[PDB]
């Protein structure tokens, strides 16, 4: 089927996500201190 | 089956990931300008 196929992209967009929440709170102690 | 549960899994992770995507525009314009 296309089981793989959302568990790809629930890693994919997990992956993606990581790294944005990263950045929001790089950006933020920055531009908050 | 559990094809829903990867379905809605995609989509909070995805609407996660755009706000995230968003607050690191937001604050890189802010702390790089």
Redesign the interface.
């Known amino acids: 089927?296309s089981?793989k196929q959302?568990?790809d992209?629930?890693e994919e967009?997990?992956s993606?996500?990581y790294h944005?929440?990263n950045?929001?709170a790089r950006?933020?102690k920055?531009?908050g201190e």
Do not use: R, W
Request: proline share 0%.
């Open positions: 089927g089981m959302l568990e992209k629930v967009l997990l993606k996500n944005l929440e950045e929001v950006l933020k920055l531009v």
